[PDB]
């Protein structure tokens, strides 16, 4: 059950900040319907982008510490990290096609 890294506040440094390569971090919560709408889409991307990218999820209620560090203000927010640095930001639900395009464009 791990293609997706399931992050915590304590593991966020190792898992994201010190990863060699691109991580796609999904800031989300259980009550958030758009967050849940995109979850299946993230599963497909995890598979599709395997070897180019890792997908990780931080649940902002269970892990309240990390989101303020990135000025997160609404969910879902997708932050693309490249080797510990944020390259791209996407706020709100989007389709698979839209996510593919956001990824393809920011991964170069």
User: Buried (b) or exposed (e) across 46-77, using 16+ Cβ within 10 A?
Assistant: beebeeebbbbbbbbeebeebbeeeebeebbb
Resolution value, angstrom units:
2.4
E-assigned strands of 1-108? 5-6, 22-28, 54-59, 77-82, 85-91
Cα 21 to Cα 69: distance, rounded to the nearest angstrom: 21
Q: Which helix (H) or strand (E) holds 101?
A: helix 96-107
Which one of 7, 22, 24, 35 is the catalytic residue? 35
Which one of 7, 32, 42, 56 is the catalytic residue? 32
Q: What topology is assigned to 1-108 in CATH?
A: Glutaredoxin (3.40.30)
Domain boundary assignment for the chain: 1-108
Q: What are phi and psi of 5, to 5 degrees?
A: -75, 135
Using DSSP's 3-state secondary structure scheme, residue 68 falls into helix
Q: Is 35 a catalytic residue?
A: yes
From which experimental method does this structure derive? X-ray
User: Buried (b) or exposed (e) across 1-15, using 16+ Cβ within 10 A?
Assistant: eeebbebeeeebeeb
């Amino acid at each position: 059950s791990e293609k997706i890294i399931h992050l915590t506040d304590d593991s966020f440094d190792t898992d994201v900040l010190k990863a060699d390569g691109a991580i796609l971090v999904d800031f989300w919560a259980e009550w958030c319907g758009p967050c849940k709408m995109i979850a299946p889409i993230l599963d497909e991307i995890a598979d599709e982008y395997q070897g180019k990218l890792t997908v990780a999820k931080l649940n902002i209620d269970q892990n309240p510490g990390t989101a303020p560090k990135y000025g997160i203000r609404g969910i879902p927010t997708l932050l693309l990290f490249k080797n510990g640095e944020v390259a791209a930001t996407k706020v709100g639900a989007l389709s698979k096609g839209q996510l593919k395009e956001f990824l393809d464009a920011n991964l170069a």
